[PDB]
Design a protein around this ligand. Structure first.
Ligand SMILES: *[C@@H]1O[C@H](CO[C@@H]2O[C@@H](C)[C@@H](O)[C@@H](O)[C@@H]2O)[C@@H](O[C@@H]2O[C@H](CO)[C@@H](O[C@@H]3O[C@H](CO[C@H]4O[C@H](CO)[C@@H](O)[C@H](O)[C@@H]4O[C@@H]4O[C@H](CO)[C@@H](O)[C@H](O)[C@H]4NC(C)=O)[C@@H](O)[C@H](O)[C@@H]3O)[C@H](O)[C@H]2NC(C)=O)[C@H](O)[C@H]1NC(C)=O
Ligand SMILES: *[C@@H]1O[C@H](CO)[C@@H](O)[C@H](O)[C@H]1NC(C)=O
Ligand code: CUO
Ligand SMILES: [Br-]
Ligand SMILES: [Br-]
Length: 393
């Protein structure tokens, strides 16, 4: 139990009550660490500097994102343990089909997981959620969950920095589509960590990282280190490196390169079976996907000082158009500027096949970009995608 992250759907009523009691104490600010102190490491109030400008400390849009958020998620989990939690932060596997948010977080009354207070505002100013409909309805009408298929393409990657782009962009969709137009909530960088669902999401995100590390181990590849962005992964994961961090284990292991070894931080998962597949069976499924000829769109992403949803259509030369996919960017005015150094890949094989289009056919791919407050943005904010054909192996 202690330090064990369980699937949220396996919690007992006693474990649920215990986690709620521990979070209530962390949010009350009377305990060893306060919810504000921890949540403030992520976005608002800006706790980092980029020269003279105050910026959010969370690392996004870069190879250090998984390690930064691994350490952050453990920091909150330790705060809960110090206030009596007997289990670790449960993970919600949102790659399984679901029709509503987990009851742990959706219960409105007597539930610390429902929302968080915004520091600096009156006590009744809290995070809210405004969930977007595609959170619950597969926008591609495909086989299994939209999020499952996106996760498989991430898990296919055999290099950490290639994995990381797929991984992080998938994780953005849950932020965007839980928070929606909420002024304070999951869909902005500034306030997302004040909603306790942040940490249920990031427990699952961290478990996906752990699953990919198991895949890399089984493949005979790097899983406790990486050979890309080598100096970047040695930078401090601010603010966890600072002397006022009361948690020894996160303060002393406060580089992304240290964060590959999650055991040393004192936690583990109940298991790492992805949809009840062992690691060898998962990798077998990934290898089978690679036997087919596929078409991908390739997007170059960068921070745009806001969060947004991108949608694209595939239109044949006669003007018949079908929805071809979607992804999200997480951000806000406090973001550290960023540009990925490689494409974000998006599988459009099925929609090309169904429209009887080859990659070298005549077609267009219209792009739309909408900020999470609902405002349409200029599609030219992002470079148009490129098209690749990948023959089956
Ligand atoms: C959500 O909670 C907020 C916050 O309310 C606070 O917390 C709750 C728990 C209670 O303790 C409240 O007493 C407390 O304020 C609620 O918003 C509050 O609602 C009440 C009732 O409508 C308002 O009362 C009115 O208050 C004004 C005076 O407001 C001045 O003084 C307040 C301190 O008493 C300050 O918070 C205000 O910012 C404001 O300060 C003024 O600043 C000007 C500068 O131009 C100067 O004149 C002075 O510096 C000062 N003026 C004064 C003191 O006259 C009063 O005139 C009026 O007659 C009412 O009594 C609260 O003002 C209001 N607070 C805020 C911050 O908006 C919401 O109602 C809650 N919402 C829900 C949905 O529940
Ligand atoms: C694309 O359209 C042009 C005319 O606009 C035509 O000459 C060409 O054959 C078309 N290509 C395909 C692959 O249909
Ligand atoms: O939180 Cu900083 O990105 Cu999920
Ligand atoms: Br709400
Ligand atoms: Br580097």
């Amino acid at each position: 139990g202690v330090g064990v992250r369980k699937d949220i759907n396996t919690l007992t009523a006693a474990e649920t009550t215990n986690l709620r009691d521990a979070l209530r104490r962390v949010q009350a600010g009377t305990g060893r660490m306060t919810y504000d102190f921890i949540a403030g490491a992520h976005g608002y109030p800006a706790e980092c500097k980029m020269g003279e400008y105050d910026v959010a400390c969370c690392q996004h849009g870069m190879a250090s994102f998984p390690g930064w958020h691994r350490v952050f998620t453990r920091q909150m989990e330790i705060a809960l343990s110090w206030e009596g939690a007997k289990v670790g932060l449960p993970y919600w596997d949102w790659t399984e089909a679901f029709t509503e948010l987990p009851t742990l977080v959706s219960q409105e009354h007597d539930n610390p997981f429902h929302h968080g207070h915004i520091p600096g505002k009156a006590e009744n100013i809290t995070t809210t959620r405004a969930p977007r409909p595609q959170l619950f309805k597969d926008p591609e009408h495909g086989e299994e969950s939209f999020f499952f298929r996106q996760a498989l393409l991430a898990f296919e990657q055999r290099d950490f920095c290639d994995f990381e782009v797929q991984f992080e962009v998938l994780h953005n969709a849950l932020h965007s589509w839980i928070g929606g137009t909420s002024p304070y909530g999951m869909s902005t960088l500034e306030y997302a960590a004040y909603d306790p669902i942040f940490f249920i999401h990031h427990s699952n995100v961290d478990r996906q990282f752990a699953i990919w590390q198991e895949l890399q181990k089984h493949r005979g590849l790097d899983y406790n280190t990486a050979n890309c962005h080598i100096q970047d992964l040695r930078k401090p994961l601010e603010p966890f490196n600072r002397a006022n961090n009361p948690v020894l284990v996160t303060r002393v292991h406060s580089r992304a390169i240290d964060a590959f070894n999650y055991d040393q931080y004192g936690y583990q998962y109940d298991h790492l079976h992805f949809h009840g597949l062992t690691v060898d069976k998962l990798d077998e499924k990934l290898e089978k996907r690679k036997e087919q000829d596929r078409v991908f769109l390739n997007f170059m992403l960068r921070g745009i000082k806001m969060s947004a949803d991108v949608v694209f259509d595939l239109c044949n030369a006669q003007g018949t158009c079908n929805f071809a996919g979607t992804f999200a960017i997480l951000g806000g005015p406090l973001e550290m500027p960023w540009n990925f150094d490689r494409v974000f890949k998006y599988d459009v094989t099925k929609i090309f096949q169904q429209m009887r289009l080859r990659p070298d056919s005549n077609y267009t791919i219209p792009i739309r970009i909408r900020a999470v407050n609902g405002m349409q943005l200029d599609p030219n904010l992002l470079e148009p995608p490129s098209v690749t054909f990948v023959p089956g192996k």
